[PDB]
Protein backbone atom coordinates (compact mmCIF):
# COMPACT_ATOMS: atom_id res chain seq x y z
CA UNK A 1 0.00 0.00 0.00
CA UNK A 2 1.24 3.38 -1.15
CA UNK A 3 0.19 6.61 0.51
CA UNK A 4 0.65 9.55 -1.83
CA UNK A 5 0.85 13.00 -0.26
CA UNK A 6 -1.98 15.23 -1.56
CA UNK A 7 -1.76 18.94 -0.75
CA UNK A 8 -4.93 20.29 0.90
CA UNK A 9 -6.62 22.01 -2.01
CA UNK A 10 -5.16 25.38 -2.84
CA UNK A 11 -3.06 25.62 0.33
CA UNK A 12 0.48 26.86 0.52
CA UNK A 13 3.15 27.81 3.05
CA UNK A 14 1.26 30.82 4.36
CA UNK A 15 -1.80 28.71 5.25
CA UNK A 16 0.27 26.28 7.25
CA UNK A 17 2.21 29.11 8.94
CA UNK A 18 -1.19 30.35 10.17
CA UNK A 19 -1.91 26.93 11.67
CA UNK A 20 1.57 26.84 13.25
CA UNK A 21 0.92 30.29 14.67
CA UNK A 22 -2.39 29.30 16.17
CA UNK A 23 -0.80 26.27 17.83
CA UNK A 24 2.08 28.41 19.06
CA UNK A 25 -0.17 31.12 20.45
CA UNK A 26 -2.28 28.53 22.30
CA UNK A 27 0.88 26.99 23.71
CA UNK A 28 1.70 30.39 25.12
CA UNK A 29 -1.82 30.97 26.43
CA UNK A 30 -2.51 27.64 28.09
CA UNK A 31 0.66 27.75 30.13
CA UNK A 32 -0.63 26.28 33.38
CA UNK A 33 -1.11 22.71 32.00
CA UNK A 34 0.75 19.97 33.87
CA UNK A 35 2.03 22.22 36.69
CA UNK A 36 3.16 24.89 34.23
CA UNK A 37 5.11 22.59 31.96
CA UNK A 38 2.58 23.57 29.28
CA UNK A 39 1.40 21.48 26.35
CA UNK A 40 4.66 21.39 24.36
CA UNK A 41 5.89 18.01 25.56
CA UNK A 42 2.56 16.19 25.20
CA UNK A 43 2.25 17.54 21.63
CA UNK A 44 5.69 16.16 20.79
CA UNK A 45 4.68 12.81 22.27
CA UNK A 46 1.42 12.88 20.29
CA UNK A 47 3.33 13.48 17.02
CA UNK A 48 5.62 10.60 17.86
CA UNK A 49 2.93 8.10 18.86
CA UNK A 50 0.77 8.93 15.84
CA UNK A 51 3.81 8.33 13.62
CA UNK A 52 5.41 5.49 15.55
CA UNK A 53 2.83 2.85 14.73
CA UNK A 54 4.41 2.57 11.27
CA UNK A 55 5.63 -0.78 10.04
CA UNK A 56 8.13 -0.59 7.18
CA UNK A 57 7.34 -4.11 6.09
CA UNK A 58 3.76 -3.40 4.93
CA UNK A 59 3.31 0.37 5.26
CA UNK A 60 0.61 -0.01 7.89
CA UNK A 61 0.24 2.64 10.60
CA UNK A 62 2.27 5.82 10.41
CA UNK A 63 1.31 9.48 10.34
CA UNK A 64 -0.46 9.59 7.00
CA UNK A 65 -3.97 8.50 7.90
CA UNK A 66 -4.50 10.38 11.15
CA UNK A 67 -6.00 7.33 12.73
CA UNK A 68 -5.52 8.41 16.34
CA UNK A 69 -8.93 10.08 15.98
CA UNK A 70 -10.47 6.56 16.09
CA UNK A 71 -11.22 4.89 19.44
CA UNK A 72 -9.05 1.80 18.92
CA UNK A 73 -5.93 3.97 18.70
CA UNK A 74 -6.83 6.77 21.13
CA UNK A 75 -7.62 4.07 23.74
CA UNK A 76 -4.33 2.24 23.20
CA UNK A 77 -2.86 1.87 26.72
CA UNK A 78 0.42 3.10 25.18
CA UNK A 79 -1.32 6.39 24.38
CA UNK A 80 -2.67 7.12 27.87
CA UNK A 81 -2.44 10.88 28.54
CA UNK A 82 -2.29 11.91 24.84
CA UNK A 83 -5.96 12.79 25.02
CA UNK A 84 -4.71 16.04 26.53
CA UNK A 85 -2.83 16.79 23.33
CA UNK A 86 -5.80 15.95 21.21
CA UNK A 87 -8.02 18.22 23.28
CA UNK A 88 -5.48 21.01 22.82
CA UNK A 89 -5.64 20.58 19.06
CA UNK A 90 -9.43 20.51 18.86
CA UNK A 91 -9.95 24.27 18.71
CA UNK A 92 -7.08 24.51 16.23
CA UNK A 93 -8.83 21.98 13.95
CA UNK A 94 -12.13 23.84 14.36
CA UNK A 95 -10.56 27.02 13.17
CA UNK A 96 -8.67 25.33 10.35
CA UNK A 97 -10.99 22.49 9.36
CA UNK A 98 -9.24 22.02 6.00
CA UNK A 99 -6.03 20.57 7.48
CA UNK A 100 -5.89 16.79 7.60
CA UNK A 101 -5.66 15.07 10.99
CA UNK A 102 -2.20 13.64 10.24
CA UNK A 103 -0.96 16.97 9.09
CA UNK A 104 -2.26 18.51 12.32
CA UNK A 105 -0.85 15.92 14.65
CA UNK A 106 2.61 16.07 13.00
CA UNK A 107 2.57 19.86 12.75
CA UNK A 108 1.70 20.08 16.44
CA UNK A 109 4.97 18.28 17.25
CA UNK A 110 7.01 20.48 14.94
CA UNK A 111 5.43 23.60 16.39
CA UNK A 112 6.08 22.45 19.94
CA UNK A 113 9.74 21.62 19.33
CA UNK A 114 10.40 24.95 17.64
CA UNK A 115 8.47 27.07 20.14
CA UNK A 116 10.42 25.33 22.94
CA UNK A 117 13.65 26.67 21.37
CA UNK A 118 14.48 23.44 19.59
CA UNK A 119 15.84 23.05 16.08
CA UNK A 120 13.88 23.94 13.02
CA UNK A 121 12.08 20.86 11.74
CA UNK A 122 11.21 20.97 8.02
CA UNK A 123 7.66 19.76 7.54
CA UNK A 124 5.71 18.58 4.56
CA UNK A 125 1.97 18.71 4.06
CA UNK A 126 -0.35 16.28 2.34
CA UNK A 127 -1.27 13.51 4.75
CA UNK A 128 -4.83 12.34 3.96
CA UNK A 129 -7.31 11.00 6.45
CA UNK A 130 -7.96 7.28 6.01
CA UNK A 131 -10.93 5.27 7.30
CA UNK A 132 -11.46 3.62 10.63
CA UNK A 133 -10.50 0.15 9.36
CA UNK A 134 -7.03 1.42 8.55
CA UNK A 135 -6.28 2.12 12.23
CA UNK A 136 -3.35 -0.01 13.39
CA UNK A 137 -3.94 -2.40 16.26
CA UNK A 138 -2.55 -1.59 19.70
CA UNK A 139 0.91 -2.88 20.61
CA UNK A 140 3.17 -1.18 18.04
CA UNK A 141 4.58 1.42 20.42
CA UNK A 142 7.54 0.52 22.59
CA UNK A 143 7.71 -0.85 26.13
CA UNK A 144 9.83 1.06 28.67
CA UNK A 145 10.86 -1.85 30.88
CA UNK A 146 13.33 -3.31 28.33
CA UNK A 147 17.02 -3.25 27.39
CA UNK A 148 19.16 -1.89 24.62
CA UNK A 149 18.71 -4.94 22.41
CA UNK A 150 14.97 -4.45 22.58
CA UNK A 151 15.29 -0.76 21.70
CA UNK A 152 17.55 -1.45 18.74
CA UNK A 153 15.30 -4.18 17.35
CA UNK A 154 12.15 -2.12 17.99
CA UNK A 155 13.37 0.83 15.99
CA UNK A 156 14.41 -1.28 13.02
CA UNK A 157 10.69 -1.55 12.28
CA UNK A 158 10.65 2.26 11.91
CA UNK A 159 13.79 2.15 9.75
CA UNK A 160 15.88 3.96 12.39
CA UNK A 161 19.58 3.23 12.98
CA UNK A 162 21.54 3.71 16.21
CA UNK A 163 22.26 7.38 15.68
CA UNK A 164 18.63 8.10 14.79
CA UNK A 165 17.39 6.22 17.87
CA UNK A 166 19.71 8.02 20.25
CA UNK A 167 18.87 11.40 18.70
CA UNK A 168 15.12 10.80 18.88
CA UNK A 169 15.29 9.76 22.52
CA UNK A 170 16.75 13.19 23.35
CA UNK A 171 13.12 14.39 23.21
CA UNK A 172 12.99 13.05 26.78
CA UNK A 173 14.47 16.37 27.82
CA UNK A 174 10.83 17.42 27.55
CA UNK A 175 7.97 16.81 29.96
CA UNK A 176 7.75 13.95 32.42
CA UNK A 177 6.41 10.53 33.16
CA UNK A 178 3.13 10.46 34.99
CA UNK A 179 2.34 7.42 37.15
CA UNK A 180 -1.32 7.25 36.19
CA UNK A 181 -0.52 7.25 32.46
CA UNK A 182 2.46 4.89 32.11
CA UNK A 183 3.41 3.46 35.53
CA UNK A 184 6.50 5.70 35.73
CA UNK A 185 6.85 8.98 37.61
CA UNK A 186 9.13 11.97 37.30
CA UNK A 187 10.90 14.30 34.90
CA UNK A 188 14.11 13.50 33.03
CA UNK A 189 15.55 16.93 33.81
CA UNK A 190 15.05 20.44 35.01
CA UNK A 191 14.25 22.35 31.86
CA UNK A 192 10.99 20.45 31.15
CA UNK A 193 9.69 22.80 28.44
CA UNK A 194 12.93 23.94 26.80
CA UNK A 195 14.43 21.72 24.08
CA UNK A 196 18.09 21.11 24.85
CA UNK A 197 20.55 18.24 25.04
CA UNK A 198 19.98 17.91 28.79
CA UNK A 199 18.80 14.28 28.52
CA UNK A 200 22.29 13.16 27.52
CA UNK A 201 24.02 15.33 30.11
CA UNK A 202 21.80 13.93 32.83
CA UNK A 203 22.36 10.34 31.71
CA UNK A 204 26.09 10.80 32.00
CA UNK A 205 26.42 13.17 34.95
CA UNK A 206 23.78 12.25 37.48
CA UNK A 207 24.16 9.55 40.11
CA UNK A 208 21.46 7.03 39.21
CA UNK A 209 19.95 4.47 41.52
CA UNK A 210 17.66 1.67 40.36
CA UNK A 211 14.51 2.00 42.46
CA UNK A 212 10.89 0.86 42.43
CA UNK A 213 8.21 3.49 41.99
CA UNK A 214 4.74 3.48 43.49
CA UNK A 215 3.40 1.39 40.65
CA UNK A 216 5.95 -1.31 41.46
CA UNK A 217 8.03 -0.70 38.33
CA UNK A 218 11.76 -0.17 38.26
CA UNK A 219 13.14 3.19 37.15
CA UNK A 220 16.47 4.95 37.59
CA UNK A 221 16.33 7.91 39.98
CA UNK A 222 18.72 10.69 40.86
CA UNK A 223 19.07 12.83 43.96
CA UNK A 224 18.26 15.85 41.82
CA UNK A 225 14.77 14.48 41.38
CA UNK A 226 15.16 13.19 37.88
CA UNK A 227 14.37 9.74 36.45
CA UNK A 228 15.31 7.56 33.50
CA UNK A 229 13.26 4.72 32.12
CA UNK A 230 15.06 1.37 31.75
CA UNK A 231 15.10 1.98 27.97
CA UNK A 232 16.66 5.39 28.49
CA UNK A 233 19.35 4.01 30.78
CA UNK A 234 20.03 1.27 28.24
CA UNK A 235 21.59 3.96 26.03
CA UNK A 236 24.52 4.13 28.44
CA UNK A 237 24.64 0.37 29.08
CA UNK A 238 25.20 -0.48 25.40
CA UNK A 239 28.63 0.61 24.19
CA UNK A 240 27.45 1.73 20.73
CA UNK A 241 24.65 3.88 22.16
CA UNK A 242 26.95 5.22 24.82
CA UNK A 243 29.36 6.73 22.30
CA UNK A 244 26.48 8.59 20.65
CA UNK A 245 25.11 9.79 23.98
CA UNK A 246 28.54 11.24 24.72
CA UNK A 247 28.63 12.90 21.31
CA UNK A 248 25.29 14.65 21.82
CA UNK A 249 26.17 15.58 25.44
CA UNK A 250 29.19 17.36 24.00
CA UNK A 251 27.70 18.97 20.90
CA UNK A 252 24.40 20.81 21.11
CA UNK A 253 24.41 21.79 17.45
CA UNK A 254 25.02 18.23 16.30
CA UNK A 255 22.18 16.97 18.44
CA UNK A 256 19.86 19.64 17.02
CA UNK A 257 20.77 18.78 13.44
CA UNK A 258 20.48 15.07 13.92
CA UNK A 259 17.23 15.34 15.86
CA UNK A 260 15.69 17.53 13.20
CA UNK A 261 16.49 15.02 10.47
CA UNK A 262 15.34 11.99 12.47
CA UNK A 263 12.13 13.64 13.65
CA UNK A 264 11.19 14.76 10.14
CA UNK A 265 11.90 11.23 8.94
CA UNK A 266 9.73 9.73 11.69
CA UNK A 267 6.88 12.07 10.76
CA UNK A 268 7.25 11.23 7.03
CA UNK A 269 7.70 7.45 7.19
CA UNK A 270 5.23 5.72 4.91
CA UNK A 271 4.48 8.73 2.72
CA UNK A 272 5.30 9.03 -0.96
CA UNK A 273 5.84 12.62 -1.99
CA UNK A 274 5.30 13.19 -5.69
CA UNK A 275 8.14 14.73 -7.65
CA UNK A 276 6.24 17.92 -8.02
CA UNK A 277 5.19 18.20 -4.41
CA UNK A 278 6.14 21.45 -2.65
CA UNK A 279 9.47 21.54 -0.90
CA UNK A 280 9.41 21.07 2.87
CA UNK A 281 8.28 24.12 4.80
CA UNK A 282 10.38 25.71 7.53
CA UNK A 283 8.04 27.71 9.73
CA UNK A 284 9.06 30.87 11.51
CA UNK A 285 8.63 30.89 15.26
CA UNK A 286 6.41 33.43 16.94
CA UNK A 287 9.55 35.12 18.20
CA UNK A 288 11.01 35.36 14.65
CA UNK A 289 7.74 36.96 13.50
CA UNK A 290 7.55 39.44 16.40
CA UNK A 291 4.36 37.88 17.54
Ligand code: HEM
Nearest residue numbers: 041042044045048081143144168171175176177178181182
Ligand atom coordinates in the same frame (compact mmCIF):
# COMPACT_ATOMS: atom_id res chain seq x y z
C1 HEM B 1 12.17 3.25 23.54
C2 HEM B 1 11.42 4.42 23.15
C3 HEM B 1 10.54 5.14 24.04
C4 HEM B 1 9.89 4.72 25.15
C5 HEM B 1 9.83 3.36 25.80
C6 HEM B 1 9.17 5.85 25.65
C7 HEM B 1 8.36 5.87 26.80
C8 HEM B 1 7.71 6.98 27.35
C9 HEM B 1 6.94 6.96 28.55
C10 HEM B 1 6.68 5.76 29.41
C11 HEM B 1 6.52 8.25 28.76
C12 HEM B 1 5.67 8.81 29.89
C13 HEM B 1 4.22 9.00 29.44
C14 HEM B 1 3.46 9.50 30.64
O1 HEM B 1 3.49 8.91 31.74
O2 HEM B 1 2.77 10.56 30.50
C15 HEM B 1 7.01 9.05 27.69
C16 HEM B 1 6.84 10.42 27.57
C17 HEM B 1 7.32 11.24 26.53
N1 HEM B 1 7.92 10.72 25.38
FE1 HEM B 1 8.87 8.92 25.22
N2 HEM B 1 9.37 6.96 24.85
C18 HEM B 1 10.20 6.55 23.81
C19 HEM B 1 10.59 7.34 22.74
C20 HEM B 1 10.23 8.66 22.49
C21 HEM B 1 10.52 9.37 21.27
C22 HEM B 1 11.19 8.74 20.10
C23 HEM B 1 10.00 10.63 21.45
C24 HEM B 1 9.91 11.73 20.48
C25 HEM B 1 10.89 12.03 19.57
C26 HEM B 1 9.40 10.66 22.76
C27 HEM B 1 8.83 11.79 23.35
C28 HEM B 1 8.24 11.85 24.61
C29 HEM B 1 7.82 13.06 25.29
C30 HEM B 1 8.06 14.45 24.76
C31 HEM B 1 7.27 12.67 26.48
C32 HEM B 1 6.71 13.57 27.57
C33 HEM B 1 5.18 13.67 27.49
C34 HEM B 1 4.58 14.52 28.59
O3 HEM B 1 5.28 15.19 29.38
O4 HEM B 1 3.31 14.55 28.64
N3 HEM B 1 9.50 9.41 23.39
N4 HEM B 1 7.75 8.25 26.81
